[PDB]
Amino acid sequence: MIEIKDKQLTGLRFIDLFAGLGGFRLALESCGAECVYSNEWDKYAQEVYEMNFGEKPEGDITQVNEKTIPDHDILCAGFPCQAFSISGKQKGFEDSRGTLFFDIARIVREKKPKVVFMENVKNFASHDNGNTLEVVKNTMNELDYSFHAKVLNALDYGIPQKRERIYMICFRNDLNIQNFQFPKPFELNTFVKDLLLPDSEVEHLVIDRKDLVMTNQEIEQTTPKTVRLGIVGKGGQGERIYSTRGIAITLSAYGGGIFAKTGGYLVNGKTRKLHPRECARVMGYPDSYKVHPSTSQAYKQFGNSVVINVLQYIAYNIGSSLNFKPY
DNA sequence: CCATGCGCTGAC
DNA sequence: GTCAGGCATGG
Ligand SMILES: Nc1ncnc2c1ncn2[C@@H]1O[C@H](CSCC[C@H](N)C(=O)O)[C@@H](O)[C@H]1O
Numbered sequence: 001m002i003e004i005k006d007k008q009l010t011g012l013r014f015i016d017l018f019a020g021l022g023g024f025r026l027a028l029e030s031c032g033a034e035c036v037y038s039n040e041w042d043k044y045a046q047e048v049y050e051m052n053f054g055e056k057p058e059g060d061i062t063q064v065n066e067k068t069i070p071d072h073d074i075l076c077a078g079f080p081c082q083a084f085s086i087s088g089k090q091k092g093f094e095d096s097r098g099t100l101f102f103d104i105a106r107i108v109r110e111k112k113p114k115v116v117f118m119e120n121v122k123n124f125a126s127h128d129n130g131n132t133l134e135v136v137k138n139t140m141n142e143l144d145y146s147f148h149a150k151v152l153n154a155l156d157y158g159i160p161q162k163r164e165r166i167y168m169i170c171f172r173n174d175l176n177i178q179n180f181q182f183p184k185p186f187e188l189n190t191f192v193k194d195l196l197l198p199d200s201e202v203e204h205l206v207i208d209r210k211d212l213v214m215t216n217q218e219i220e221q222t223t224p225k226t227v228r229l230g231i232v233g234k235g236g237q238g239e240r241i242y243s244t245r246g247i248a249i250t251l252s253a254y255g256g257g258i259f260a261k262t263g264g265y266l267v268n269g270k271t272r273k274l275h276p277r278e279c280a281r282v283m284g285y286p287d288s289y290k291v292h293p294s295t296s297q298a299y300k301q302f303g304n305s306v307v308i309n310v311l312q313y314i315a316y317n318i319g320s321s322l323n324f325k326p327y
Numbered sequence: 328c329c330a331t332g333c334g335c336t337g338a339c
Numbered sequence: 340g341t342c343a344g345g346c347a348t349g350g
Contacts, residue, residue, distance in 0.1 A: 086336045087345035254345050256331045
């Protein structure tokens with residue numbers, strides 16, 4: 001994550017729904033905002049959140065009376081994406097994990113925050129012939145919000161990961177916000193190799209498969225793209241090896257393969273998974289952030305999470321818009 | 328709970 | 340054709 005000198009969101013209150021690791025919290029707090037409520041139902045996510053922020057999020061949002069939620073200015077929600085991902089069944093709103101947006105809508109209707117700030121997978125914009133996104137837009141419009149949606153790739157915002165997500169920013173109509181812009185992409189100057197731990201700290205992550213097939217030469221020149229170097233097995237998910245001189249493939253939460261959740265990388269002549277701290281860095285988490293004691297849960301958590309830096313630029317622009325109030 | 332081989336998908 | 344992006348089942 002980056003340093004934010006001008007605290008655009010000072011004095012504003014936010015809630016952290018589907019909190020996970022608290023990526024939205026780190027991003028908005030860096031812009032000066034104050035968290036007043038958090039909600040997350042996974043036992044291990046609750047633990048890591050408490051380890052980092054000192055508080056246990058409330059559980060199952062579907063059973064929370066929306067009237068009990070504190071007054072707030074910005075509602076944040078990176079809501080579940082399994083039902084919308086191209087790696088899943090794409091049942092969408094028909095999936096029990098696919099109806100959480102309607103809980104967001106229920107809370108917005110009651111609490112009427114200035115801003116609603118949501119994140120999901122890129123496929124959310126395409127799913128069901130665009131109807132899924134249109135449902136969200138229309139729901140927010142019906143609640144008297146404007147709707148701004150764009151897919152952003154983390155590699156365009158200083159983080160070496162291909163991670164294309166949809167970001168949906170909504171302003172209450174009475175605020176007359178007409179100048180919200182998504183942040184402009186800029187040149188990437190950091191690559192996977194720049195975020196790696198020393199070899200001595202990751203020896204246990206080395207995998208030596210005799211069915212490794214190298215399909216492409218290692219590169220010496222860094223590049224802002226994924227660079228496949230080889231495969232093991234049949235080369236499905238988690239069975240693909242990439243160059244550290246490129247960017248990381250997207251981290252996953254429920255993924256498998258021998259290099260599960262992180263993918264495999266060529267490091268000093270050997271192939272290995274990423275360490276959870278390398279996952280944190282690939283998601284823009286600061287080294288001060290405390291990783292969950294279970295490595296399996298840590299990988300799941302980072303796989304579900306948000307890239308802090310992207311959220312910081314967006315949050316800064318939300319604040320920039322709210323603050324422009326000429327006579 | 329933790330581990331891993333898929334077996335498809337959207338987008339080229 | 341290519342490549343990046345959760346489910347099922349094993350224990
Ligand atoms: N009914 C529910 N109540 C509370 N949390 C829920 C929920 N259904 C799913 N979730 C949680 O919603 C999260 C979506 S992933 C969100 C990750 C978060 N943005 C971060 O910064 O890490 C998951 O952690 C999942 O456990």
